[PDB]
Design a binder for this molecule. Structure first.
Ligand SMILES: [Cl-]
Ligand SMILES: [Cl-]
Ligand SMILES: [Zn+2]
Ligand SMILES: [Zn+2]
Lengths: 21, 27, 26, 20, 21, 27, 26, 20, 26, 20, 27, 21
C-alpha cells in the first residue's frame, strides 16, 4: 500500500504518480 | 505514529504530482 | 490561486477521514 | 469540494462527506 | 501533555478537540 | 527530533479541529 | 480565504515560539 | 494576529509577540 | 498574500528537485 | 518563480527548472 | 525516510526564517 | 549539512538563519 510502499523507503515522484486517478 | 506523519506528506505529494488527474488515499 | 486551497483541503481530509481514506478531484 | 470548500470555509462536518 | 499524549500514540480528532479553548 | 516534527502536525490539526474556538500550544 | 493564512500563521508561531508555546485565536 | 499578519506579512519579530 | 504561495512553492520544489536541492528567492 | 508560478499554477515541469 | 520528512520541515522553516534573503537547499 | 545538522538534533531559528543567502 501507499503507506507500505512509501513510508518505509523514500518514493520518487514517478513512483507516486502511479497512485493517481 | 511515524506512519501517520508520513501519510500527511504522502497526500501532499500526491496532490502536487497528481494534479487535475486526482487521487484516492487509502492506508 | 485555488490550487493553494486544494493543498489545505487534502490535509484536512487527511485528518478527518483517517483510516477510511478519501478522494480528491478538481 | 473545491467549489464547496474553497469559497466558504467547510466545517469538519462538511468535509467528512468527502471521505472514502 | 499534547506532545506526551499525541506523539507517542496517534490521537483522534476527538481527542485533539480537548486541547481547544 | 521526532517530537518536533510531530508538534508541527499537532498544531496544524489543532488549528482545523479547534477553529473559531482557538487553542494554546504547550510542549 | 483568510483561513489559509491562519494555517500558515500557526506554523510560523510554532517555529518562532518553540518550547514557550503560543496561543491562536480568530 | 489575523488582522495584523494576514493583510501585511509579519516579521519573525512581530510574530514573536504572539508566543505564550 | 503571495507569501503563502512561496511556502507552497518551496514544498513543491522540495519534492521535485530532491537530492539535487534547489534555490528560492523573492 | 514567484512571478511565474504564483499568478498561474506551474507544472512539475516548470518547477523543475528551479532545481539546483 | 525520517530524513526526508524532516527535510520538508527544514525548507519550510528556512523559508520563514530566510524571507527576502532567500536560500539554497542541499542534502 | 543542513540535514546532517538539523535532522539529528533540533535546530533553533538562529542556527537555521545561517543557511540563508
Ligand atoms: Cl513529518
Ligand atoms: Cl495558502
Ligand atoms: Zn497554504
Ligand atoms: Zn511533517
Amino acid at each position: 500500500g501507499i503507506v507500505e510502499q512509501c513510508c518505509t523507503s523514500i518514493c520518487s515522484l514517478y513512483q507516486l504518480e502511479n497512485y493517481c486517478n | 505514529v511515524n506512519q501517520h506523519l508520513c501519510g500527511s506528506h504522502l497526500v501532499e505529494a500526491l496532490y502536487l504530482v497528481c494534479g487535475e488527474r486526482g487521487f484516492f488515499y487509502t492506508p
